[PDB]
Amino acid sequence: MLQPGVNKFSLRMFGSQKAVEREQERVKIHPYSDFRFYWDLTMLLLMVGNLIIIPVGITFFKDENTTPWIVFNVVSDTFFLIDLVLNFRTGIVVEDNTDIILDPRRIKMKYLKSWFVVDFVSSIPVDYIFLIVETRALRIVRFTKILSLLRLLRLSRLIRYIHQWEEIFHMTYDLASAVVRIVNLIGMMLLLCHWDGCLQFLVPMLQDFPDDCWVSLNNMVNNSWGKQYSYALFKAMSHMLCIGYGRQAPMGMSDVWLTMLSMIVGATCYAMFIGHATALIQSLDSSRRQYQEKYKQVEQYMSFHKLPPDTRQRIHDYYEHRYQGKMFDEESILGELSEPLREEIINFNCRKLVASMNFVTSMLTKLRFEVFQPGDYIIREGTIGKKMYFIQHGVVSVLTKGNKETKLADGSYFGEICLLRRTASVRADTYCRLYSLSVDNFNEVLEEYPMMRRAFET
Amino acid sequence: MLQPGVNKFSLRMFGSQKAVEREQERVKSHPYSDFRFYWDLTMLLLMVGNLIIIPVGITFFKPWIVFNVVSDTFFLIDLVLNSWFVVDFVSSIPVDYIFLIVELRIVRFTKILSLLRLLRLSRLIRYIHQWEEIFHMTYDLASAVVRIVNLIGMMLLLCHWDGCLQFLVPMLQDFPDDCWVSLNNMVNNSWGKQYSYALFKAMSHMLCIGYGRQAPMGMSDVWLTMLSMIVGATCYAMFIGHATALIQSLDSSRRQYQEKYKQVEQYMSFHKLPPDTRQRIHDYYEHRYQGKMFDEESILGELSEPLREEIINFNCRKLVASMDPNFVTSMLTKLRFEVFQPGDYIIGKKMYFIQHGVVSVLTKGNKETKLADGSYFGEICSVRADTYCRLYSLSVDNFNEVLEEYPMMRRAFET
Amino acid sequence: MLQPGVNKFSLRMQKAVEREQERVKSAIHPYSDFRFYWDLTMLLLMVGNLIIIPVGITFFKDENTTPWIVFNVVSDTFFLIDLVLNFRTGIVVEDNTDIILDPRRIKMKYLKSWFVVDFVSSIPVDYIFLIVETRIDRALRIVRFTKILSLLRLLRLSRLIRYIHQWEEIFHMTYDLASAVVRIVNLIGMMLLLCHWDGCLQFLVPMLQDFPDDCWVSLNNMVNNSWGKQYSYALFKAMSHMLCIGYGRQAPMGMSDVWLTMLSMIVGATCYAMFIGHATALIQSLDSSRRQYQEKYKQVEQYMSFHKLPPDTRQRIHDYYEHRYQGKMFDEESILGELSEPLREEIINFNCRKLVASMPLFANADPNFVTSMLTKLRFEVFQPGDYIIREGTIGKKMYFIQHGVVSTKLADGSYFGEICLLTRGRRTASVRADTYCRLYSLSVDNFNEVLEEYPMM
Amino acid sequence: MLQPGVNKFSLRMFGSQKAVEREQERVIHPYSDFRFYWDLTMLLLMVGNLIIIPVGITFFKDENTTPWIVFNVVSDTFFLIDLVLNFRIKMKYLKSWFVVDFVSSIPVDYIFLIVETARALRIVRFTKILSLLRLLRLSRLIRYIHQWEEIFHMTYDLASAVVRIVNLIGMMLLLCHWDGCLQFLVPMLQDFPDDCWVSLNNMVNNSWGKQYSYALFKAMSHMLCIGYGRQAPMGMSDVWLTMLSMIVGATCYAMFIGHATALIQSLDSSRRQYQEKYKQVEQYMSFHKLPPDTRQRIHDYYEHRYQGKMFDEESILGELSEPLREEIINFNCRKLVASMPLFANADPNFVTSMLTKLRFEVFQPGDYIIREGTIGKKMYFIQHGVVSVLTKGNKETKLADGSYFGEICLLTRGRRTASVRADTYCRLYSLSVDNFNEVLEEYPMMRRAFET
């Protein structure tokens, strides 16, 4: 299973099949192996369970040496040693370059600059081994508890595993991905609040019961772990939201300093999260802002030249019925694409129109999109012929004595004459989305294409 | 009648009347029709009444039987006329009354079923968006205040929901001694006071001021105020972020003007510019752009040909005609805007058209010639500027292409 | 006298000033000195009223003392005077000299700018109401309605902001950090005025309802305390509502207090939120070229990572950027483009005459095409160790050394290999860069085209 | 060592010692190493006094013992030496901060009380007020730190960002404890009022530890806008001090949060500039109706061409100088363009010009690169991926990195003899025929060599 390649992500990370096979011959543990996926899924599950339950067990409750908590801790930590020794035989992507690092020497030397020390200190049963090497009892309990808090260093594993797997899975960068990111931020913040509540319940217990503690004043001595956890989370979330100090203001120096640090970090983190979410939602609403800026610049330009209200209203109508209220660019998007994709776009969008009438593939590279408005002349009499048109969605009425009122439907074509002084003229009935072809473009595309131009001229 | 026949908001969707007859066969095959507009308006009024009345009735005052049955009739009209199907299927029928047919806990079940009736706010969300672009006034500061007031509006109905919920939860489970009601002794006071205190706790929790006159004691109070605080603060913070972003976007053009002037400040810092020029540059930007930015070239090259023709005509018809439509029009299509500054020398291969201001001519023979709006000069193939002129330019080369492109009387023009 | 004859702000917007006189010779101009001083007198007197009236009408119960009445009536006389002077005045709006000398024109324009508010604020509605009541002749109701109708005078905020805006659009000479501080202190002034008004209201709303036991005045034992020791705590509650600190000493109890607290939380916190957003926007707009430089460097580093460049180049490019743009943007081509001619040639002259005129060929000739080719010059920045030109390479680009000394050693004002342009072939000199030499450049094509367009020399 | 010749990052400013020799030729230098050591000791002693002076003034009533006198006189002497060292350029500085530096450096309070020796208690109050006004090392520290910003900086990445927020929070905690000591000092100077908060809290004779750790709590509660403290102000000098504390704390915290959020947002800017472009393109496909397959095959092209890494190749190349563009293009393309035999014998100048005429191009698997019967227009130097060339009765021949397909019709014409197809995301380097023609017409040295 160490050989990578799964249609869920490998076929998207590597569009062609062969590249995926190339990954396989790279082996001839891999980052993209399915066994790695299963291992990291089980990891995330069990280790998030640890990050949630360990602060509850070690801060609240008594008689920690009971069988269920002990066996849970030892099995989790043994899995942690397993993945720790696995980290000495693995591979990661470096600076986005796909490097297998199947050599243990490399995955040791270059890993000797990572956070390996954090994983070392976290993934060893410090509480048990420190108790054994020592073997004042309350003081030893204090050390073993405060070092048991070091099991929460698995947040580093969580964040690194998320970072290596944030880019693997995507569906659509719309509200679906944005809500995923904001939900991840909210989950991290509630994890922080849970940790802070457990800390504010444990620091009194670590000192043993004070008389100047929030626990004594609130009489939360021997009621329940559920209510105590609920009220500690209450204090932590009130601190970050800046509601207050719960029921009573701090009374003891220990709790004064504790609430000071808790509320400073909570307020700072809440402000950071709120600003990040606001920036994310503005990025979601980015498409409207560009159009708003362009329209405000247009309005200021019209005011700078003192245009009459009729022209201003016509300009407003043209802008609202050209860009449809949110902005895009023809030139840049058609210039930042490879040849096959550009020809695919110009074929699908603009081939049915020409098919209603390799020269064509070279003529299609000169069709300029163009939108007019009702009542506006397209071609005017007395104007030298310089352009034709290819209706994509519009109805143009020819102005002629014979052609009193016509409605040219989709896929029509006019102005072709004088290509090879307009005889007539046409208006716009509805919102017509024309195309265009300058006579110079036709002359060029023809003169680099002579081997059929010798019959085109006829 | 499915025929819209609207010349006020359907005219914005389709400017010409002809498309109206097109919409005619669109009927013969409507969201913009009169009947749908009337139905949506009546349903909108009734559902606003729903959102601001039913939470009051379900929580307080444990008549109203008249209002709920008639409301359900119009909801059924929506479903038969009709993405979000189970939501309407649940919050479109009298679930509370029909639940008793299936069956104190039962009575409580009817109310929590009625709590699902609020989901039409989602229908309002979709509706309020699709009325947003059909009609508009302008993009001035006034419309922004309207948007902010509407934002405050749905956040305030959210406050109403939150207060009703915060009064209901300690009311469903009788009234425990640890509930905020028991602590405030306001068990049997007036409806006004109860609603005021509920909306007050909700207001404080979202606005992060306090809990009120007390602090949560029972587990129900703690957890209720818990989620109240988190959701209220979060939603209010995003609301304020959106409002401030919109306000800052209102005066955008001034912002880009300021950033461009800051970049010019850096540029003048680099080249050790003398203070006189460092002040003249500031004045020239204060009057050329008037502290608010635009780009004439991009806008002109972006507009459709008839529109661009309209603006260029309205700007320069009197200017050029003061010296065939096609030749003069092509000449107009090549005028550049060259706002000058007082005391700046002007001029010889270019001619100048003065739209605004006063220009002076310096010569040794005659003392000067005073010119005004519309006068043409520089016609060859030095002079000063007195006021903040807005001269127009005609480069000789551009004149050459304008002449050569039309050969009907080209040799006559060069003659 | 009514003619605008100032030499401070009318100068900024010279013969046009005489044209301003012309627009008055057709007969008060908004830019007139007397108008400006009179508007300043209203500025002071408006600030005074907006502070005193809410305190006077709320505090100092049974306000039958004479000096307050004298001050109020004289202020009302100034208000009638300035309202009637608002008739037949020039209003420069839309950056256009709309002097509207026509009485109908000034009438309609003033009727387009909160006319009815101006009348209702200017007229002493309290005095007229009391005099008509005395002419006519529930007593306590009339007593409270006296203060209620005197409260109509707070509509003068609209006039105050209108006058300051008529001056805000004039005083815009600075847009540096000083202007940001001016905007910030204006925001703080408006916010503190709202604090003062909310504090006065926190007492007025109870006061107009006498003093019920549920009001905070009763519970705080502040019924009989001094006026200062009441205003201070009222403003304390106003700021405690605005800043979202708390309800004050004790939570709201009565329905009136609860609803007033709700309204104060809204009008307080929302306005403070807009204030904070404005402050953050201004402090970020203070430093923007640094942000743009950071974005450009991030894009360049991102591109450099895209091409898997060796670390030596990844250090050389970083050094080049930090010693070329040095954390602050400058786009020479665009800035020069969007400048009118005379400023452009002035900048180019001051930059380039001493540098380029060192060698004799262009110095001898007439400086018109010389100025043109100077405007055609380009900015180039080099780094030590990189050879500017190579031996056995076609010499086509001269260099005018504005700064630094590079290798013989050439000091500032020298020139690099100008003989290559007039000759042709491969240059045999490999000049070595030794300093951060900011040079100037051109091309042989530019030289050929300037000699073609100007073949006189 | 009063000259800036140093063997550290100062060299990064001025590479060659001859460039450094210019400053040695001109030349106390602020950039000198001795001034560097003096600035570090200034920083250390300045932060020490900025933490200790407000506490020494307020809680330590009549600290007439010798240690405090020694501390104060050492500070006075060292600040005076710093002032006299900080002194041609003085006239430019003359209208700046000499009143500031004079009042900050000298012991105004101590010299004031010497000439004096209920007037005595008022003199003590004046001494305390003068020593408080002497705290202008806030401004001094701001100046000296702001000097360092231009002096040295490695990168503006996340590493420096967290440092910037840490600096802001350190300055803000400086403000916190200043306000904490103030909230005790102002009531203390009046003598403990009955209605004051200290009296209500019974914190009248408690130790320095409590009187500091709860005053700090009170003074940064108003900063985090959490509340007042144990009680409402009650006292009215107290409520005015609460006015000032509320305003300054909330306003400064608002500015600090705005600045920090803006920094963390500008930290990730390229991703935003790519997301905006992708939203624009998404609207482009929404406008001209297209099948979902084309939408997917454009999304894939962006995800494997820009990779979410938003950069503009033309602008980045242009804004660089030629003696820096040359190394980039060389490292990217010397192996590729020297691979084919015809250009291996080409002139280095001709090679570099052809490199400057090279253009980056990307393709997708299954998409034709060159077709059958089309007019040949460009040339290709494959840099990545594998390409499948199909030439009539030919199987899927697979060229690799460094190869070249399309070299035909480099100067000739005719229809395409073969059709190629991309097997992977082959990142090519295109090369148009007209560019080849123009480089040969401006380098006619080997026109006759390439004529064959």
Ligand SMILES: COc1cc2c(cc1OC)CC(=O)N(CCCN(C)C[C@H]1Cc3cc(OC)c(OC)cc31)CC2
């Ligand atoms: C009163 O101070 C602020 C208020 C607002 C804003 C900014 C403020 O300070 C940064 C804008 C905003 O997002 N908010 C944040 C609201 C979040 N909390 C709940 C508001 C209150 C608690 C908090 C947190 C603060 O710091 C961010 C703060 O600074 C004085 C004020 C407050 C809404 C209005």
